[PDB]
Amino acid sequence: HARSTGSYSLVTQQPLGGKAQFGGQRFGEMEVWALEAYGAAYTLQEMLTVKSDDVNGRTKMYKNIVDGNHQMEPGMPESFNVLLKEIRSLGINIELEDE
Amino acid sequence: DKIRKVLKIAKEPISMETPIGDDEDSHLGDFIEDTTLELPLDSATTESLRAATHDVLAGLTAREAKVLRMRFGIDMNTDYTLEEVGKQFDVTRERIRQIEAKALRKLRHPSRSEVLRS
Amino acid sequence: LKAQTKTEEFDAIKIALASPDMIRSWSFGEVKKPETINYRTFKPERDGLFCARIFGPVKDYECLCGKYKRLKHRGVICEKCGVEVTQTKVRRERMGHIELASPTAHIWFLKSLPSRIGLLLDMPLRDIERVLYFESYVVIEGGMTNLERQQILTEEQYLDALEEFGDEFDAKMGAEAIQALLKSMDLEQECEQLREELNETNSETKRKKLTKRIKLLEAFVQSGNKPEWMILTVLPVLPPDLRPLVPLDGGRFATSDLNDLYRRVINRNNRLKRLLDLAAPDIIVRNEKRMLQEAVDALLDNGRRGRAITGSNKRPLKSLADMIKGGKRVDYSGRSVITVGPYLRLHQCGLPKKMALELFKPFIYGKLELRGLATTIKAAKKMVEREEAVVWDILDEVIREHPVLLNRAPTLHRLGIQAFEPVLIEGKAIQLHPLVCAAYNADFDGDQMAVHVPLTLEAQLEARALMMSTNNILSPANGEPIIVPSQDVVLGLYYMTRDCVNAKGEGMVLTGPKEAERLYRSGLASLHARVKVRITEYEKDANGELVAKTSLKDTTVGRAILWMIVPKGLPYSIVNQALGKKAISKMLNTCYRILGLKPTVIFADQIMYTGFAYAARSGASVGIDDMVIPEKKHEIISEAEAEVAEIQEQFQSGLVTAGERYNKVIDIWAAANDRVSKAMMDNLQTETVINRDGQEEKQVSFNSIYMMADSGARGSAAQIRQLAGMRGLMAKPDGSIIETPITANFREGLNVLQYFISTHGARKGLADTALKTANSGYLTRRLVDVAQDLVVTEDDCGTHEGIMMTPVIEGGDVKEPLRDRVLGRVTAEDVLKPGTADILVPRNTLLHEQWCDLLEENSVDAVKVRSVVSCDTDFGVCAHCYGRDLARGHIINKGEAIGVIAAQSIGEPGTQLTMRDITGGLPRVADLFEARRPKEPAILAEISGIVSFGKETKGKRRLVITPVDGSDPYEEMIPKWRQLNVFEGERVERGDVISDGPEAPHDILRLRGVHAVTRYIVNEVQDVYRLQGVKINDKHIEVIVRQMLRKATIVNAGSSDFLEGEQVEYSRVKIANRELEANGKVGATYSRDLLGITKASLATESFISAASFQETTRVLTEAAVAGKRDELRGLKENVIVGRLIPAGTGYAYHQDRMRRRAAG
Amino acid sequence: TPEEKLLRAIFGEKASDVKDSSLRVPNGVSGTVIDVQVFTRDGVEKDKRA
Amino acid sequence: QSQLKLLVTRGKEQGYLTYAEVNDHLPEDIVDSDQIEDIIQMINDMGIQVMEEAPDADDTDPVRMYMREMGTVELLTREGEIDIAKRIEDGINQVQCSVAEYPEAITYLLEQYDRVEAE
Amino acid sequence: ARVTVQDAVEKIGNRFDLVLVAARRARQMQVGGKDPLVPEENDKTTVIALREIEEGLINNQILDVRERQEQQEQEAAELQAVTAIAEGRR
Amino acid sequence: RSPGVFFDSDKGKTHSSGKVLYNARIIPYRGSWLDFEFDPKDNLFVRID
Ligand SMILES: Nc1nc2c(ncn2[C@@H]2O[C@H](COP(=O)(O)OP(=O)(O)OP(=O)(O)O)[C@@H](OP(=O)(O)OP(=O)(O)O)[C@H]2O)c(=O)[nH]1
Ligand SMILES: [Zn+2]
Ligand SMILES: [Zn+2]
């Protein structure tokens, strides 16, 4: 199996297919251990955001690829923004203040 | 057929949190793909299309670029008709359509928009 | 003059309670109808759970009705229906709220271990706090006569007390009653009076609850949260997209359970609102309130009390909490079955053509449109979708120096993911280098690996400068090489030695490379003779460089030709003069330490190529006649059975103890097994006769199997002993051993009986394997969770103290030395010398300078070395104090990630640990790290004094020892059970043994010393790896034990509140800032405390990191109570947020941002 | 989108009010059709090939 | 006494956390999904001190608690029902009479009537 | 540096900063002002920066200083426009 | 597990100290479980289903 870019689930904007392509591979805890061990901060940075479930990030970075710019321009993944809305959905309030 | 449509309203129905394959662990709501989103490839092609068309209307004249641009309404939101453009360019209707047809005549050699079609 | 009001960069996130007005701030409308979607039009209702005006539009830019369609009105709402036409993702982020009638208690702050609403109010949970709000027993809200302030009354008591007084002590019941109860509560005045009362003439009979609540009350009042928010009056609503009802295939909608919950709570709340306007029967309305409580409690967090249901499913409904209490799929990835690739290098991998085509799709597109060919992006798509030859050439350009990292399923350590250079291979399988096939612990049984494509620029360099296979020469666990040649290659190089006498031999001398021409041209053999040749050696000394050294040594054909592979340096010949076994790795090791990286890599490729090639040339096979059975087998068996026959006959006529003759006869068969094993080995080893010149001589058998055994290549003594010898004593399901061992062997026939006996061993073998394989990772998780936060920082601090390193010697009564545990270690300070000078102060023991610790004779077997255990660092690890042990030869780079690498290295060999005064195995490791007290703990003398009996069994009691000397006595408690070791009158030292049994780590750390307890743990955890034969450096053990001693306990008087056990982090940083601040008397003295891995990991600053592993429902709630904030240096909590990790390639980013967050 | 409206206008609209969802053999595999089959609804115009 | 001494003395520390043990040594009605969480929360985690926070905290159902207050019968007969109904009509009558005293209610009825006839 | 990359770390300690600065230089080359120092020989921008660092040229202080000169060149050489804008709002 | 009744072991440490504590159990084909077990104090208890 191999996947450049395909569909995503409605609930969590994570890669999945089986209708035209193949749902991308799963990372997990075992792998993030290794990346932390190496120190590949940007590798894990992309692997956790744009490369996975960053709505605008994946597209912005894809455009950066076809233009031969690479870089990244990341953002907060929906798999954490959703968690904010879920916790905020309770009587408990969480905010992300600046400095 | 009325009865057919009736049975299409029965049941709650099913919830997403229903186990299916019993993996580790399966969930019906996890197989549902999103469709409101567009493919990144599709987005890139649309972007390149804007640049392509924005680069094609450069090889035209002002009284032809603006004509094709305004008639089919591009980069100006509200699209106008033959009358609203025929009044702003003196000669009304047919005249502005002639150029509108001539502009289309020019685009019979370039391959950019051709391949962008598909 | 900043103060920006946009979504910019955040330095921290805060967690706390939410006010009703705070909920209103998120409210983009109020859900008022249980309605979701229309039954016919399938259109969002007015004010339902899926409103368009409240939340977001269905379609992207067109409204509900259709008065407005395109981007013309993206900022203006619709006229007929107030629908803000923006995006459809808005429907995913819009909140909304429901405003309940009568107050409702939050299920979390109500019943979650401690009653947060109770403990803050000081009132029983499921006892009193239940009956007073479930409409049963009215409660008081402050009384100035007869009644107290928080007593519980019945309706009879209520009316009676109302008749006696009344109209001056009004106190309602139910939800709003508890609301007024918390609201009337004054945290400030209570904080004062509680501090006053709970300090007046009271010993240790009260101090517990006193200090507890006062710290809790102080925390809550300082938090900023008002106790009013404890029970909510306005319940917010989760966005529709996070709980949608999407139509599936051919009708049959699919909705979330939250919709059912919200629909129920909306219904019951509405009826409650309607009842408070119509006729108001007390029983009916109060019940509806209890029902409203049910709905709300079910929606917030089901748990927990019977479990709400409905929805046809017999299974419960996933509440809000259940969706956040308890794997990251990624684009640009793939996987396939792996295959050996001999012709490949050490930094290359076989990547399938079609596979690599789909992977670098976007890159191929851009490169195509860059050169030409494709007129546009879609042209490239249509050009690669129709694989048009030329595209492949473009592929050869994009994958040129674009590294791709491979990964195996069981990721134990860092070498689970290694990067390679992509090489196109006409096939659908992924080829891999057979050298790094050991680091993955991968076989070609059909195992499949995954591939990832480093998209980011710095991500590519990360994979090349860190995750590249060429940079991982040595194992992170042990300094020894990891890419060391295995079975096939080592067998080949073993065949390229093996000096055989005569047979086309003779001492025909030449000059190195010339000998190659001799080998291909036949005439001479290959394993002769020995024969002499001219070897041009190369050495360096002092001023480095190179010094030639031509000589005439007596090697062989194989050694001569193989010598060409050896790099410029090295002692030469003598590395080849040996053979192929374990020195095969030694040669690679020395090549690395004396030359460098690249030379070691190319040397590895050459020795692999050579090994494989000559291995094929050899043609070593495995026939049935290769495993020769001993002739004395039947003899030995008959003799053994004769002895056991005599023993059985003796047992028949009494004499010998029949109760344990079982054991001694086992010794008979066991001894017999050793006889057969020794006989087979002595036979299969030497043998042969040859015929040198005048014939008659002996070497060693060229018997294939033996060649495999005497050269690694998967072939051990036990296995061979079972092949030709015999399978010895077999295990029985009872746990006992059968007194009739497998006399036969695999070379011979096997009776049904003994095979039905061996099936037990195979069954329990696979079963135990399945257990310890998962149990190993089970331990790894705890190790990582507790250690994955410390990173080597602040370069190299001061301090000299450190554990005195000494060779682990069991040689006291068994003779077993190990003195390589000191290397790459930074010296404490000039560790003496039988005379003067020598060793410097902070000089790290080099690989060549550790061999200098042999020129100082066997006298010097003790050196003080800086370790991570000590180190006067604060929130990190001194570079010097750690070491250097990596795939790198130098010291650990500042800002690495010691924690995860340490944990991984520890839990890596966990797969090969046999679970069981010696427990032994993985369970022993777990118990040692958890710091658990033994089943029969020994006792020590806390203070050196005079041993004397303290009233013979006068309690209670049980003996009592009182070591008293100098000043003040001590009365320990001996429970009669178990004897002693010191008579009365005798004197003892500070920490002497007075039980001669198992020692407890807590007592060691508490009394003996930190160096002693750490030495104990490391030297006890190694002893379980010694038997298992798994090499692992002590550094990592010292690393986990470092933060294993994270917290302590202060006992005196200072700015810290005494009884509170706090970590030495804040302690040391605050004690240093008090001796020269105002006065050293405003601070106390601390005392280290030993706590297990689990207990240590339980405590952590970040509430998000805590919300990860441990119970989320608890940590999130308690962190909500006190206005806590993650800010924000942890690795784990910084991963789920999706940002740069505060380590490795990052760190510098976090360092800059950390200093940046000092202005305000 | 305006650009797409112009583009089709340059090469011919034919903007049918229909989409596409034809069953296509997945990319990678390839073989020979050995048997077709059609299960029609009870009350639907049967197909020619059916 | 019983619950405290049994829980503490037995669990030291039950090794594998033998849950299926003391839950039967507890009184009242069993097989509940309520007391389940209050035991898995005390055994581990905050060890030692938590075992002192349990007893101090130890020092139910909608329908069953609804039947409780409903238990107060106060049932009626034909005489009772008619009696209550009579009080109802008496109250209603007194109210309507009190409204009859109000002249502005009549004149307003007159005004709204002329509004009705005026359509 | 197709295989260490280890010969570059001893030129600037801690491989991590090596990755940062190398990624920095590679960022300059891939997009914007290219102009490599070491001959390309058909190699990606990924390795080109590493070869330069190995060669001895292009470090951290070097790039920062050249950035200072780059800023002083873009700003000071084109101040005639900014100064004319400074008189915009007095 | 075959229906009927059998006496289980439960031998070994079940409450420290270590002392047998045998127990009987009746397993129906279609009904409710009927167990009989001892305790450290040598009392007899019954478990219905
Ligand atoms: N240390 C180092 N090596 C370099 C460098 N540039 C190229 N190489 C070597 O180039 C070798 C590969 O040569 P080729 O296979 O012909 O590829 P090239 O066409 O040469 O690319 P090129 O122009 O050199 O960059 C590798 O062989 P190997 O021997 O390593 O692979 P192994 O030991 O497994 O054989 C690299 O070591 C460099 O800047 N530093
Ligand atoms: Zn509208
Ligand atoms: Zn240090």
Side-chain angles (χ1 to χ4, degrees), chain C residues 291-303:
Chain C
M291 294 170 54
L292 176 61
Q293 192 68 220
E294 264 274 304
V296 174
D297 290 332
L299 183 152
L300 298 184
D301 184 17
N302 224 91

PDB file of all heavy atoms in Angstrom, chain C residues 291-303:
ATOM      1  N   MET C 291     -35.053  13.980  37.299  1.00  0.00           N
ATOM      2  CA  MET C 291     -34.941  13.414  35.960  1.00  0.00           C
ATOM      3  C   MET C 291     -34.049  14.292  35.089  1.00  0.00           C
ATOM      4  O   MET C 291     -33.294  13.793  34.253  1.00  0.00           O
ATOM      5  CB  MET C 291     -36.322  13.254  35.323  1.00  0.00           C
ATOM      6  CG  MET C 291     -37.209  12.237  36.023  1.00  0.00           C
ATOM      7  SD  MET C 291     -38.915  12.277  35.444  1.00  0.00           S
ATOM      8  CE  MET C 291     -38.676  12.084  33.680  1.00  0.00           C
ATOM      9  N   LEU C 292     -34.143  15.603  35.288  1.00  0.00           N
ATOM     10  CA  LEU C 292     -33.264  16.544  34.606  1.00  0.00           C
ATOM     11  C   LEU C 292     -31.825  16.307  35.039  1.00  0.00           C
ATOM     12  O   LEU C 292     -30.900  16.383  34.233  1.00  0.00           O
ATOM     13  CB  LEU C 292     -33.676  17.988  34.896  1.00  0.00           C
ATOM     14  CG  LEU C 292     -32.771  19.069  34.301  1.00  0.00           C
ATOM     15  CD1 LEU C 292     -32.752  18.977  32.784  1.00  0.00           C
ATOM     16  CD2 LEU C 292     -33.212  20.453  34.752  1.00  0.00           C
ATOM     17  N   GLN C 293     -31.647  16.023  36.326  1.00  0.00           N
ATOM     18  CA  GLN C 293     -30.337  15.697  36.873  1.00  0.00           C
ATOM     19  C   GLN C 293     -29.790  14.438  36.207  1.00  0.00           C
ATOM     20  O   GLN C 293     -28.610  14.363  35.869  1.00  0.00           O
ATOM     21  CB  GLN C 293     -30.420  15.506  38.389  1.00  0.00           C
ATOM     22  CG  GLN C 293     -29.073  15.455  39.089  1.00  0.00           C
ATOM     23  CD  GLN C 293     -28.345  16.784  39.045  1.00  0.00           C
ATOM     24  OE1 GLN C 293     -27.131  16.835  38.853  1.00  0.00           O
ATOM     25  NE2 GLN C 293     -29.088  17.870  39.224  1.00  0.00           N
ATOM     26  N   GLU C 294     -30.664  13.452  36.026  1.00  0.00           N
ATOM     27  CA  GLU C 294     -30.305  12.206  35.357  1.00  0.00           C
ATOM     28  C   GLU C 294     -29.795  12.449  33.940  1.00  0.00           C
ATOM     29  O   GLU C 294     -28.759  11.913  33.544  1.00  0.00           O
ATOM     30  CB  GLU C 294     -31.506  11.259  35.321  1.00  0.00           C
ATOM     31  CG  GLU C 294     -31.528  10.237  36.445  1.00  0.00           C
ATOM     32  CD  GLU C 294     -30.730   8.992  36.113  1.00  0.00           C
ATOM     33  OE1 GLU C 294     -31.021   8.360  35.077  1.00  0.00           O
ATOM     34  OE2 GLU C 294     -29.812   8.647  36.887  1.00  0.00           O
ATOM     35  N   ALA C 295     -30.531  13.255  33.182  1.00  0.00           N
ATOM     36  CA  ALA C 295     -30.176  13.551  31.798  1.00  0.00           C
ATOM     37  C   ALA C 295     -28.833  14.269  31.703  1.00  0.00           C
ATOM     38  O   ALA C 295     -27.974  13.893  30.905  1.00  0.00           O
ATOM     39  CB  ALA C 295     -31.268  14.382  31.141  1.00  0.00           C
ATOM     40  N   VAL C 296     -28.661  15.305  32.517  1.00  0.00           N
ATOM     41  CA  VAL C 296     -27.425  16.082  32.525  1.00  0.00           C
ATOM     42  C   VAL C 296     -26.228  15.239  32.952  1.00  0.00           C
ATOM     43  O   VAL C 296     -25.169  15.289  32.326  1.00  0.00           O
ATOM     44  CB  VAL C 296     -27.533  17.305  33.451  1.00  0.00           C
ATOM     45  CG1 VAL C 296     -26.188  18.004  33.562  1.00  0.00           C
ATOM     46  CG2 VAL C 296     -28.595  18.264  32.939  1.00  0.00           C
ATOM     47  N   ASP C 297     -26.399  14.468  34.022  1.00  0.00           N
ATOM     48  CA  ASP C 297     -25.332  13.608  34.522  1.00  0.00           C
ATOM     49  C   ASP C 297     -24.944  12.548  33.496  1.00  0.00           C
ATOM     50  O   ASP C 297     -23.783  12.154  33.408  1.00  0.00           O
ATOM     51  CB  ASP C 297     -25.747  12.938  35.834  1.00  0.00           C
ATOM     52  CG  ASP C 297     -25.823  13.918  36.989  1.00  0.00           C
ATOM     53  OD1 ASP C 297     -25.094  14.932  36.958  1.00  0.00           O
ATOM     54  OD2 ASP C 297     -26.609  13.672  37.929  1.00  0.00           O
ATOM     55  N   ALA C 298     -25.920  12.093  32.719  1.00  0.00           N
ATOM     56  CA  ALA C 298     -25.671  11.088  31.692  1.00  0.00           C
ATOM     57  C   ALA C 298     -24.915  11.684  30.509  1.00  0.00           C
ATOM     58  O   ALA C 298     -24.052  11.035  29.919  1.00  0.00           O
ATOM     59  CB  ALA C 298     -26.982  10.469  31.228  1.00  0.00           C
ATOM     60  N   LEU C 299     -25.247  12.926  30.168  1.00  0.00           N
ATOM     61  CA  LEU C 299     -24.627  13.608  29.037  1.00  0.00           C
ATOM     62  C   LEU C 299     -23.176  13.989  29.324  1.00  0.00           C
ATOM     63  O   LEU C 299     -22.296  13.786  28.489  1.00  0.00           O
ATOM     64  CB  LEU C 299     -25.434  14.855  28.665  1.00  0.00           C
ATOM     65  CG  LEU C 299     -24.969  15.667  27.453  1.00  0.00           C
ATOM     66  CD1 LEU C 299     -26.143  16.393  26.821  1.00  0.00           C
ATOM     67  CD2 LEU C 299     -23.879  16.656  27.843  1.00  0.00           C
ATOM     68  N   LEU C 300     -22.935  14.543  30.508  1.00  0.00           N
ATOM     69  CA  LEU C 300     -21.599  14.993  30.890  1.00  0.00           C
ATOM     70  C   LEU C 300     -20.627  13.826  31.006  1.00  0.00           C
ATOM     71  O   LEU C 300     -19.535  13.851  30.438  1.00  0.00           O
ATOM     72  CB  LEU C 300     -21.651  15.760  32.213  1.00  0.00           C
ATOM     73  CG  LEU C 300     -22.479  17.044  32.227  1.00  0.00           C
ATOM     74  CD1 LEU C 300     -22.347  17.749  33.568  1.00  0.00           C
ATOM     75  CD2 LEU C 300     -22.056  17.961  31.093  1.00  0.00           C
ATOM     76  N   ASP C 301     -21.038  12.803  31.745  1.00  0.00           N
ATOM     77  CA  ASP C 301     -20.211  11.626  31.977  1.00  0.00           C
ATOM     78  C   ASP C 301     -21.101  10.489  32.450  1.00  0.00           C
ATOM     79  O   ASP C 301     -21.581  10.495  33.583  1.00  0.00           O
ATOM     80  CB  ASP C 301     -19.115  11.919  33.003  1.00  0.00           C
ATOM     81  CG  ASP C 301     -18.168  10.750  33.197  1.00  0.00           C
ATOM     82  OD1 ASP C 301     -18.149   9.848  32.335  1.00  0.00           O
ATOM     83  OD2 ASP C 301     -17.449  10.732  34.218  1.00  0.00           O
ATOM     84  N   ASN C 302     -21.306   9.505  31.582  1.00  0.00           N
ATOM     85  CA  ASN C 302     -22.199   8.398  31.890  1.00  0.00           C
ATOM     86  C   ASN C 302     -21.728   7.574  33.082  1.00  0.00           C
ATOM     87  O   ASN C 302     -22.407   7.528  34.106  1.00  0.00           O
ATOM     88  CB  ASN C 302     -22.359   7.493  30.668  1.00  0.00           C
ATOM     89  CG  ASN C 302     -23.801   7.088  30.429  1.00  0.00           C
ATOM     90  OD1 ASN C 302     -24.536   7.764  29.709  1.00  0.00           O
ATOM     91  ND2 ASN C 302     -24.214   5.981  31.035  1.00  0.00           N
ATOM     92  N   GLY C 303     -20.570   6.932  32.950  1.00  0.00           N
ATOM     93  CA  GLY C 303     -20.057   6.083  34.010  1.00  0.00           C
ATOM     94  C   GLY C 303     -21.071   4.984  34.248  1.00  0.00           C
ATOM     95  O   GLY C 303     -21.369   4.239  33.316  1.00  0.00           O
TER      96      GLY C 303
END
